[PDB]
């Protein structure tokens, strides 16, 4: 073969310990750049003027944060949605002040994680598998796009992207609640049903398969030794599992087809999480949670509060306090 | 803002002249030719593959349409669709600048609590722009604001002397029809009380098209991966007697 | 939920954080294992809809553990190789998460919160330029408590005059 | 920063004690027949 041919063969080789592939040629460098910049910024970055009001917020370990408080802080509200690569700054010191590492990181990351998804399709094709693992991964991926790209686009600034940090994540959540009433939004509700239900079904499936493992070991050894990698025979008795679960509830509420069951395990969390991502991505354009504020009124016209009104008071607390020096005019319109 | 920035009907009409000729030339081309060798070797040729390509394309178009209705006020006139999010935020700053200047404020030299101008400040390249959070929206352009713009951005002479009642009205209208509102169409911020039945057509059109574009990307992946597998002959599962991984060397 | 944020700063609590990891970790495991089995299936029928090509009483695995294992080893670096372990882990993770969150809530019964980092507060009290996302979220908490308590806790008969309510500029 | 002075030894032994337990058990497994 010529050089190109040999290179292609190596790139697409099914024999590399980690698959490379064409998606991987973009994934590898972009994820490395995002990782390296994040690590260095998380340890050593100086404070960043996230809200463009010359009030820099310290995200890094060496500037007074611990693992829980630390973050790579979003780029400046003065920048908005302008593209701020290192070479647009007059100096690294300026680049740091304005939150340039955040943009470098989230753009390389979103590109690399999209290539991670393509790479899952690509390897499944090389191995003669069915192709849709990558469609499952599109759910967390879509959620990362929602919080790092679509929400900033809708609101007009990457300063409203989710911070890269534990406390900054909670900050993004509380402010999101104040501004969109996300808890009262049905797509976030489907999200919760997706992850609580994913956890429930994860534990359920775990416990049912575990409950019906066929005896292959003694009591002084792990039952795990009862299964050998690549054996042809199933390692539990599906018929006993269904016999169990169909009686727990009733026969027709239990799956007797493993393909059906596994498809349900894939679909329930993935679809709920697609709705979570879409909740964020549509609240990005300010179509917000249900608003029943003062919905219940008595015969005279007195407001009779409901729990929706109590939520509203908590939300008001968040709204009036957030970014306490950034608003000059009475309405928070983005 | 790529194509979404188109801001005058001469460019819109000219673009469609081009696009109409490109599409007719392209169509004649494809009637008169058969696909070349390099295209033959790059694609999957099946009904399901073609569907996948179109799903990919419609997905892309959906996201673009979302951004077009969110930001563009030329082919989506604010007279008909309501103010854009950037527009309404700028209209708020304009409203209170007019209000407080009528009361006697000197709005060019008024320093806000952070040290930045309360009404007016500079963009990162120096242009004079409204201050407060709408600093992010200084790329906004609209017919009611533009008369106040000079070569260096918002002009303080024009602001002090030339603001007409129709600009005050329009900025007030747009500020109080910002595209924020609940799913049950209660207009305003999420803590606002019931009273105003309003969700901007811009929010309806952006959110619906995002959802549609998103699920179309999913359908693109679903069908593109399926078309590949079907073409290569393993869409129904792995042949137990010819399992490809079993003829591959160990990774370790 | 919002009460626990504003009063207990419950997001900051490492027992709640372990809960979150086991719920989201369990949802992850649920999705990835369902998708993996569905995408490493053996061709066991002629149908393009593949559900009918399974029989409850069949001896043989319906999907290839070996191919699945190779796939994830090469995509992610590691992979399951033991199905008994895999399914045990699916029990362990969300179950363990829930039990951890319960322990944190037992502390909250007593207001024994992870509310604060003392080092953070000592620094911020002396240095009015020092700000982190941790100090920002406490400002949000103080707003939640002041704005919601009078209607949320009616037996206290709270009356908070407008002038005492914590607010930032304009809002 | 005014941290708790015991956090360093608490953290160090929290890692070391169980990590060493595991390494002990691992190595004597490997050394079996």
């Amino acid at each position: 073969a010529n050089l190109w041919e040999r290179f292609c063969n190596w790139v697409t080789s099914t024999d590399n310990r980690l698959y490379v592939g064409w998606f991987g040629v973009i994934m590898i460098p972009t994820l490395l750049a995002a990782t390296i910049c994040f690590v260095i910024a998380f340890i050593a970055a100086p404070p960043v003027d996230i809200d463009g009001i010359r009030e820099p917020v310290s995200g890094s370990l060496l500037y007074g944060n611990n693992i829980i408080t630390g973050a790579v802080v979003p780029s400046s509200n003065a920048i908005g949605l302008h593209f701020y690569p290192i070479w647009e700054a007059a100096s690294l010191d300026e680049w740091l002040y304005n939150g340039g590492p955040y943009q470098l990181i989230i753009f390389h990351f979103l590109l690399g994680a999209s290539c991670y998804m393509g790479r899952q399709w690509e390897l499944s094709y090389r191995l003669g598998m069915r192709p849709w693992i990558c469609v499952a991964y599109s759910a967390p991926l879509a959620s990362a796009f929602a919080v790092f790209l679509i929400y900033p686009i809708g609101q007009g600034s990457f300063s409203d992207g989710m911070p890269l940090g534990i406390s900054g994540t909670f900050n993004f959540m509380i402010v999101f609640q104040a501004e969109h009433n996300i808890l009262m939004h049905p797509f976030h509700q489907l999200g919760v049903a997706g992850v609580f239900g994913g956890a429930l079904f994860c534990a359920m499936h775990g416990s049912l398969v575990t409950s019906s493992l066929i005896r292959e070991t003694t009591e002084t050894e792990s039952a795990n030794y009862g299964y050998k990698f690549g054996q042809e025979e199933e390692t539990y008795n599906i018929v006993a599992a269904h016999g169990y679960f169909g009686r727990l509830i009733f026969q027709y509420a239990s799956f007797n087809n493993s393909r059906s069951l596994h498809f349900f395990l894939a679909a329930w969390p993935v679809v709920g999480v697609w709705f979570a991502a879409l909740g964020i991505s549509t609240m990005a354009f300010n179509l917000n949670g249900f608003n029943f504020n003062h919905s219940v009124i008595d015969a005279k016209g007195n407001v009779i509060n409901t729990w929706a009104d109590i939520i509203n008071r908590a939300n008001l607390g968040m709204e009036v306090m957030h970014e306490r020096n950034a608003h000059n005019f009475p309405l928070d319109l983005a | 803002g790529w194509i979404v920035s188109v801001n005058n009907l001469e460019d819109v009409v000219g673009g469609h002249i081009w696009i109409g000729l490109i599409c007719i030339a392209g169509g004649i081309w494809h009637i008169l030719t058969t696909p070349f060798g390099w295209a033959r070797r790059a694609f999957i040729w099946s009904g399901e593959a073609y569907l996948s390509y179109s799903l990919g394309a419609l997905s892309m178009m959906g996201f673009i349409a979302t951004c077009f209705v969110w930001f563009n006020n030329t082919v989506y006139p604010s007279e008909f669709y309501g103010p854009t999010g950037p527009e309404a935020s700028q209209a708020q700053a304009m409203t209170f600048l007019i209000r407080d200047q009528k009361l006697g404020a000197n709005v060019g030299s008024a320093q806000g609590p952070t040290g930045l101008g309360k009404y007016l400040m500079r963009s990162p390249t120096g242009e004079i722009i409204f201050g407060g959070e709408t600093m992010r929206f200084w790329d906004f352009r609209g017919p009611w604001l533009e008369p106040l713009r000079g070569p260096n951005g918002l002009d303080l002479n024009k602001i002090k002397n030339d603001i007409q009642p129709w600009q005050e009205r329009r900025a007030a209208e747009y500020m109080t029809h910002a595209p924020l509102g609940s799913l049950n169409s209660v207009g305003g911020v999420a803590t606002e009380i019931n009273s105003v039945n309003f969700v901007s057509p811009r929010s309806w059109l952006a959110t619906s098209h995002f959802v549609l574009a998103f699920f179309f990307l999913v359908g693109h992946l679903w069908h593109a991966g399926r078309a590949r597998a079907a073409a290569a002959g393993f869409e129904k599962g792995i042949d137990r007697e010819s399992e490809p991984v079993l003829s591959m060397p160990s990774l370790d | 939920l919002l009460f626990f944020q504003g009063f207990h700063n419950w997001t900051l609590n490492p027992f709640h954080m372990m809960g979150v990891a086991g719920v989201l970790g369990g949802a992850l495991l649920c999705a990835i294992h369902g998708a993996t089995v569905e995408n490493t299936l053996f061709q066991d029928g002629e149908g393009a809809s593949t559900f009918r090509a399974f029989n409850p009483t069949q001896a043989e695995e319906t999907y290839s553990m070996v191919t699945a294992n190779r796939f994830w080893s090469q995509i992610f670096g590691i992979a399951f190789s033991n199905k008994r372990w895999l399914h045990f882990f699916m029990l362990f993770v969300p179950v363990t998460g829930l039990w951890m969150s319960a322990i944190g809530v037992v502390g909250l019964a007593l207001n024994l919160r992870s509310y604060d980092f003392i080092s953070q507060e000592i620094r911020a009290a002396e240095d009015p330029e020092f700000e982190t996302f941790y100090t920002k979220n406490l400002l949000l908490n103080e707003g939640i408590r002041a704005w919601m308590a009078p209607q949320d806790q009616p037996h206290e008969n709270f009356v908070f005059p407008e002038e005492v309510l914590p607010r930032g500029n304009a809002l | 920063m005014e941290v708790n002075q015991l956090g360093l030894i608490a953290t160090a032994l929290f890692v070391l004690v169980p990590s060493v337990f595991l390494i002990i058990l691992y190595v004597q497994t490997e050394s079996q027949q």
């Binding site: 370990l61 990698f229 | - | 670096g77 | 920063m1 360093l8």
Partner: peptide, 30 residues
């Protein structure tokens, strides 16, 4: 000391990833 501790634990976890991947017990059909 605290920063050193955080970075130290992180660097151990990264090393652990390296060994868990490249120096895993190999899966064997048997």
């Amino acid at each position: 000391m605290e920063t050193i501790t955080y970075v130290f634990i992180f660097a151990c976890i990264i090393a652990l990833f390296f060994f868990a991947i490249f120096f895993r017990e190999p899966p064997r059909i048997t």
